[PDB]
Design an enzyme around this catalytic site. Structure first.
Site, PDB file in Angstrom:
ATOM      1  N   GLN A   1     -11.438  -5.277  -0.391  1.00  0.00           N
ATOM      2  CA  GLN A   1     -10.788  -5.985  -1.480  1.00  0.00           C
ATOM      3  C   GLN A   1     -11.726  -6.116  -2.671  1.00  0.00           C
ATOM      4  OE1 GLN A   1     -10.845  -8.129   1.778  1.00  0.00           O
ATOM      5  NE2 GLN A   1      -8.776  -8.969   1.806  1.00  0.00           N
TER       6      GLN A   1
ATOM      7  N   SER B   1       0.750  -1.242   0.000  1.00  0.00           N
ATOM      8  CA  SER B   1       0.000   0.000   0.000  1.00  0.00           C
ATOM      9  C   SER B   1       0.780   1.292   0.000  1.00  0.00           C
ATOM     10  CB  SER B   1      -0.987   0.011   1.148  1.00  0.00           C
ATOM     11  OG  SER B   1      -1.951  -1.038   1.003  1.00  0.00           O
TER      12      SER B   1
HETATM   13  B1  LIG Z   1      -1.924  -2.161   1.943  1.00  0.00           B
HETATM   14  O1  LIG Z   1      -0.540  -2.701   1.939  1.00  0.00           O
HETATM   15  O2  LIG Z   1      -2.150  -1.635   3.300  1.00  0.00           O
HETATM   16  C1  LIG Z   1      -2.959  -3.316   1.622  1.00  0.00           C
HETATM   17  C2  LIG Z   1      -2.629  -4.409   0.815  1.00  0.00           C
HETATM   18  C3  LIG Z   1      -3.518  -5.497   0.597  1.00  0.00           C
HETATM   19  C4  LIG Z   1      -3.113  -6.709  -0.286  1.00  0.00           C
HETATM   20  C5  LIG Z   1      -3.019  -7.898   0.651  1.00  0.00           C
HETATM   21  C6  LIG Z   1      -1.729  -6.571  -0.924  1.00  0.00           C
HETATM   22  C7  LIG Z   1      -4.150  -6.999  -1.354  1.00  0.00           C
HETATM   23  C8  LIG Z   1      -4.787  -5.433   1.216  1.00  0.00           C
HETATM   24  C9  LIG Z   1      -5.134  -4.340   2.021  1.00  0.00           C
HETATM   25  C10 LIG Z   1      -6.514  -4.275   2.725  1.00  0.00           C
HETATM   26  C11 LIG Z   1      -7.310  -5.553   2.498  1.00  0.00           C
HETATM   27  C12 LIG Z   1      -6.375  -4.075   4.214  1.00  0.00           C
HETATM   28  C13 LIG Z   1      -7.267  -3.075   2.209  1.00  0.00           C
HETATM   29  C14 LIG Z   1      -4.218  -3.267   2.221  1.00  0.00           C
END
Ligand SMILES: *[B]([O])([O])C1=[C]C(C([C])([C])[C])=[C]C(C([C])([C])[C])=[C]1
Length: 352
Positions: free
Chosen positions: A117, A61
């Protein structure tokens, strides 16, 4: 590298790596404008490849910061406005719940509870439209923040529509290339695969899997040198020669909403500096937001930051414009966020 920087970094990161069993780590400290680099351990355990300043890590993210700045650049160009309805750029989005949901809402997770997601089952463009058409908002727009890949992901995709470019082409030509981020990739080219670290999850080597709106929400890979340059660029946007990009960076650090002590930008999140370190685990966290009307332009006296995770990687970026100080921590294990923040704070507080 001043002995002071060396000592504060090693005394903080060495125990972090030990406690968290991190296989490989790279750190950049930006101190009075200049970057200082540190590396530990392995990019690939089985092939005994060390972390270097050329190793690619999944940003997860932290990619949202690139998306927010690309969108800011499109606003500055006059291609989009954050006040624009979502449906201006996606007229096929005809379902009634979209009336009132603006690009601002998408970018700042305030659309009304867009899902965290995009489902893995969404594989086609028509799948994507069905998903957003059928989504039932929990809340009116602009009332609660729910951090979500389907929200900022859609903002990134729509923000580049008037350019005529693909998201990746827009990012490359408008952000990566002008900032000389020449080892930062949405898709790692075959020539650069030798430098792509493995991530480690329960001791297994893993890389992030393809998904809808991945590039826009979590799909960037970069090196510690390019990430240091990204921090430099976001600390001092006025040094940037491309006018709309300079403006885009500033827009991404504007304060649009407040939840507790935190202010939501475009990608970036901010707190007033000096910041209580405990003020800087939960899968889903709905929070009421207060609108900042109008948004506050980028406050130099801020702790500006973003965490990133993928299955195998944990990243963190934090900087304080007023002090010309910043840090990037890239690791190939996803370890707890509080440990990232505590480490970053210990280092920047000592150098400030
Ligand atoms: B981010 O790194 O905070 C991020 C990444 C992901 C993946 C697992 C890479 C799809 C998912 C999220 C959520 C599900 C918390 C939004 C956040």
């Amino acid at each position: 590298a001043p002995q002071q920087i060396n000592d504060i970094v090693h005394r903080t990161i060495t125990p972090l790596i030990e406690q968290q069993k991190i296989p490989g780590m790279a750190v950049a400290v930006i101190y009075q404008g200049k970057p200082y680099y540190f590396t530990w351990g392995y990019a690939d355990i089985a092939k005994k490849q060390p972390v270097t300043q050329q190793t690619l890590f999944e940003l997860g993210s932290v990619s949202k910061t690139f998306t927010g700045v690309l969108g800011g650049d499109a606003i500055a160009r006059g291609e989009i406005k954050l006040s624009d309805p979502t449906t201006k750029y996606w007229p096929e989005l005809t379902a009634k719940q979209w009336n009132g949901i603006t690009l601002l809402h998408l970018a700042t997770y305030t659309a009304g509870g867009l899902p965290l997601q995009v489902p893995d089952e969404v594989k086609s463009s028509s799948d994507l439209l069905r998903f957003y058409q059928n989504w039932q908002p929990a809340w009116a727009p602009g009332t609660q923040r729910l951090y979500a890949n389907s929200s900022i992901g859609l903002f990134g995709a729509l923000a580049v529509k008037p350019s005529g470019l693909s998201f990746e082409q827009a990012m490359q030509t408008r952000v990566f290339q002008p900032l000389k981020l020449n080892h930062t990739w949405i898709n790692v080219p075959p020539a650069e695969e030798k430098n792509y670290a493995w991530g480690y999850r329960e001791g297994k080597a893993v890389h992030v899997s393809p998904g809808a709106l991945d590039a826009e929400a979590y799909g960037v890979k970069s090196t510690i040198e390019d990430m240091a340059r990204w921090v430099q660029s976001n600390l001092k946007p006025l040094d940037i020669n491309e006018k709309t990009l300079q403006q885009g960076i500033q827009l991404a650090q504007s304060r649009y909403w407040q939840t507790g002590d935190m202010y939501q930008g475009l990608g970036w999140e901010m707190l007033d500096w000096p910041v209580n370190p405990d003020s800087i685990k939960i899968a889903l966290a709905a929070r009421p937001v207060k609108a900042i009307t109008p948004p506050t332009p980028a406050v130099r006296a801020s702790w500006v930051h973003k965490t990133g995770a993928t299955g195998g990687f944990g990243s963190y970026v934090a900087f304080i414009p007023e002090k010309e100080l910043g840090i990037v921590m890239l690791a190939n294990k996803n370890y707890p966020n509080p440990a990232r923040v505590d480490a970053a704070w210990q280092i920047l507080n000592a150098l400030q």
